[PDB]
Amino acid sequence: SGFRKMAFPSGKVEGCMVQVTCGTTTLNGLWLDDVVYCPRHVICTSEDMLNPNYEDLLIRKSNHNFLVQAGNVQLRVIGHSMQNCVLKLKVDTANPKTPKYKFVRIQPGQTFSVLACYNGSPSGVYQCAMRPNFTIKGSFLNGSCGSVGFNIDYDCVSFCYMHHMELPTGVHAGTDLEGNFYGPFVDRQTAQAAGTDTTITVNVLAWLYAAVINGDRWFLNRFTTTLNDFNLVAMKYNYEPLTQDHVDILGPLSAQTGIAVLDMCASLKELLQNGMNGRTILGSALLEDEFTPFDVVRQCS
Amino acid sequence: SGFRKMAFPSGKVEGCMVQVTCGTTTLNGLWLDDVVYCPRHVICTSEDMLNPNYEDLLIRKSNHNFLVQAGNVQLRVIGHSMQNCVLKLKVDTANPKTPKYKFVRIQPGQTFSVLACYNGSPSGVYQCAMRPNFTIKGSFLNGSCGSVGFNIDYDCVSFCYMHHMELPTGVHAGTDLEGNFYGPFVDRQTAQAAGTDTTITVNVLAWLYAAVINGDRWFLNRFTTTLNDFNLVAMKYNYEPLTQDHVDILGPLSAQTGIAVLDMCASLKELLQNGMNGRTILGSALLEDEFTPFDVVRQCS
Numbered sequence: 001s002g003f004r005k006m007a008f009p010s011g012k013v014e015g016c017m018v019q020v021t022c023g024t025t026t027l028n029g030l031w032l033d034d035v036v037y038c039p040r041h042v043i044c045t046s047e048d049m050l051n052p053n054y055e056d057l058l059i060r061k062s063n064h065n066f067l068v069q070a071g072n073v074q075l076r077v078i079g080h081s082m083q084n085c086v087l088k089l090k091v092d093t094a095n096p097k098t099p100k101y102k103f104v105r106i107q108p109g110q111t112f113s114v115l116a117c118y119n120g121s122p123s124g125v126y127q128c129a130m131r132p133n134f135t136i137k138g139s140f141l142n143g144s145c146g147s148v149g150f151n152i153d154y155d156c157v158s159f160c161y162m163h164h165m166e167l168p169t170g171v172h173a174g175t176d177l178e179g180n181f182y183g184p185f186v187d188r189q190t191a192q193a194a195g196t197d198t199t200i201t202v203n204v205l206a207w208l209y210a211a212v213i214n215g216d217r218w219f220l221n222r223f224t225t226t227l228n229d230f231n232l233v234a235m236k237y238n239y240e241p242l243t244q245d246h247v248d249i250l251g252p253l254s255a256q257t258g259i260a261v262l263d264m265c266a267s268l269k270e271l272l273q274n275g276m277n278g279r280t281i282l283g284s285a286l287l288e289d290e291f292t293p294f295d296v297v298r299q300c301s
Numbered sequence: 302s303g304f305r306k307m308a309f310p311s312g313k314v315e316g317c318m319v320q321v322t323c324g325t326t327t328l329n330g331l332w333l334d335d336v337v338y339c340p341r342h343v344i345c346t347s348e349d350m351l352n353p354n355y356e357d358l359l360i361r362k363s364n365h366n367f368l369v370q371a372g373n374v375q376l377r378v379i380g381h382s383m384q385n386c387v388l389k390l391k392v393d394t395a396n397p398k399t400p401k402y403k404f405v406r407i408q409p410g411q412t413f414s415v416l417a418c419y420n421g422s423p424s425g426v427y428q429c430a431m432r433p434n435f436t437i438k439g440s441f442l443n444g445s446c447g448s449v450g451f452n453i454d455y456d457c458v459s460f461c462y463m464h465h466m467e468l469p470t471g472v473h474a475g476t477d478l479e480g481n482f483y484g485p486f487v488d489r490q491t492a493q494a495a496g497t498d499t500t501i502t503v504n505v506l507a508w509l510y511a512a513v514i515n516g517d518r519w520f521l522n523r524f525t526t527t528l529n530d531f532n533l534v535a536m537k538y539n540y541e542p543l544t545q546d547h548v549d550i551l552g553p554l555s556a557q558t559g560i561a562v563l564d565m566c567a568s569l570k571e572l573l574q575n576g577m578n579g580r581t582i583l584g585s586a587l588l589e590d591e592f593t594p595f596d597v598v599r600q601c602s
């Protein structure tokens with residue numbers, strides 16, 4: 001038993017991390033087959049980022065201006081184009097360590113593992129969730145651009161996130177592997193800001209089910225409440241609305257503990273109105289919304 | 302910026318996890334060179350565990366009673382011996398993916414990454430700290446025995462933990478890779494209980510430093526204090542004593558933030574005596590003690 005923020009094993013992704021250097025800037029790239037993916041802002045100076053015409057800046061770049069280094073073997077760039085905000089550098093060597101992979105665009109609320117890398121070398125791995133405002137609360141220092149987020153579904157690695165930037169509030173924004181930013185953010189130095197975040201309600205409920213499975217049961221009561229009257233309480237405390245799809249998703253968790261989904265919502269109602277009163281749930285004094293229902297089933301059985 | 306529980310990349314360790322089968326029991330083994338390491342309770346039936354004589358039980362097992370499977374590659378066992386509480390199966394094939402490794406015995410308060418495995422296949426990775434009572438608050442299910450804990454010092458993997466059992470309180474106990482249990486626990490079905498746990502003071506201080514590095518300064522005060530005056534408050538709240546060695550370790554962190562250790566101690570003293578008043582630090586409403594000063598420096602720079 002026990003419940004931890006658990007990342008996927010990073011081995012299959014470590015073998016795809018390379019170093020990409022453009023002039024004086026070094027960041028991380030993702031080497032899949034004969035392509036290296038990285039954030040396009042590698043080609044920008046600090047002056048360019050005030051107002052970058054990326055099409056024009058990339059035109060001033062030649063194939064020989066990009067230095068890709070896989071460990072100690074230099075990969076020769078034979079082609080470069082721009083797909084949205086990612087730069088795809090075609091190289092003369094297919095990665096022999098290329099796993100079965102897929103590029104996916106996740107929805108807010110879903111989670112993924114982050115392989116934080118610096119200079120093409122992995123530094124650590126941790127779990128993140130796409131927030132409702134399309135940011136992630138990660139751990140990224142300078143040099144970490146190009147680090148990727150992923151899930152391992154069956155035997156296939158689903159890449160979903162590539163790190164691009166940190167916002168003034170300390171949260172992080174990036175794109176999918178086709179170059180499309182999650183959210184309204186852009187890769188330039190402007191006054192962009194993360195909108196008001198909300199709590200992922202279906203995730204908190206799955207975490208409470210994880211708490212019940214692991215013995216923590218003090219917050220359970222005999223009350224109940226309709227889906228409509230719970231959402232009224234959820235709006236005042238900045239929680240996402242709970243839909244019937246959400247209740248269907250929580251089916252396996254509800255059917256496992258014998259506690260109905262709506263009965264769990266009544267317990268969450270009481271925790272929001274009163275608080276925890278100095279108690280803890282799964283070692284936490286706050287309600288945790290970064291575990292999807294999939295994450296709980298994968299870890300609790 | 303940002304601060305997350307960050308595990309080491311697990312790729313080097315994944316290539317060493319194998320499946321060990323003895324009769325109807327299957328658990329995980331560690332394949333380094335031509336030796337496979339796994340818990341010795343693999344040879345035991347449920348009835349054996351009430352009072353196991355491991356020398357006698359191993360005496361009736363032959364080499365052919367042990368099946369080792371590295372994925373789909375069967376490794377034939379040519380030798381078996383018992384070192385303390387671990388079984389060493391000598392196999393006919395050296396592991397071609399063996400990394401530069403070392404067996405280390407960590408001290409209470411240190412942290413490590415855990416690669417949770419089932420049937421020789423990795424499931425996930427997360428960070429754990431050796432508690433002062435020599436337990437860990439991990440996430441393990443049935444079949445996870447033989448999963449290992451490790452740190453990655455330079456290019457060398459320092460194996461420090463192998464999982465053996467879950468205690469009644471939901472915490473977990475295991476051995477080092479030489480078979481010696483952390484703590485007083487034994488691999489038999491008896492009334493085992495973890496001792497009183499305490500809070501790792503030097504880790505909380507490093508964490509508050511991490512918080513200051515991240516911009517959380519609301520707890521910083523104008524008052525200072527002394528070591529004995531701080532330890533007096535620490536002893537009342539189940540906190541481990543603060544030594545000068547601890548203050549030496551907090552050198553780089555104190556020398557980087559501008560706050561002195563004793564000045565951070567007075568801030569912690571006030572947090573213990575008064576509480577956090579519903580405020581949060583680094584997204585937590587509780588004081589965190591599972592980050593060593595090394596972990597903070599590695600992550601914050």
Ligand SMILES: O=C(c1cncc2cc[nH]c12)N1CCC(=C2c3ccccc3CS(=O)(=O)c3ccccc32)CC1
Nearest residue numbers: 041044045046049140141142143144165166188189302
């Ligand atoms: O390396 C991190 C990094 C990544 N993640 C977290 C942190 C924390 C500190 N640095 C971090 N860069 C922050 C994001 C970067 C840029 C950028 C790109 C090219 C040239 C200059 C700059 C500086 S820019 O400010 O104009 C800016 C503005 C908007 C979007 C991107 C960028 C690169 C460095």
Ligand SMILES: O=C(c1cncc2cc[nH]c12)N1CCC(=C2c3ccccc3CS(=O)(=O)c3ccccc32)CC1
Nearest residue numbers: 001342345346347350441442443444445466467489490
């Ligand atoms: O697979 C997990 C496992 C590992 N980690 C967490 C969980 C949660 C559920 N199961 C978990 N085994 C629990 C630990 C085990 C044993 C054991 C070993 C051989 C034969 C029987 C038994 C059952 S025993 O109870 O007599 C016992 C008592 C003391 C020490 C070890 C053991 C094996 C299964």
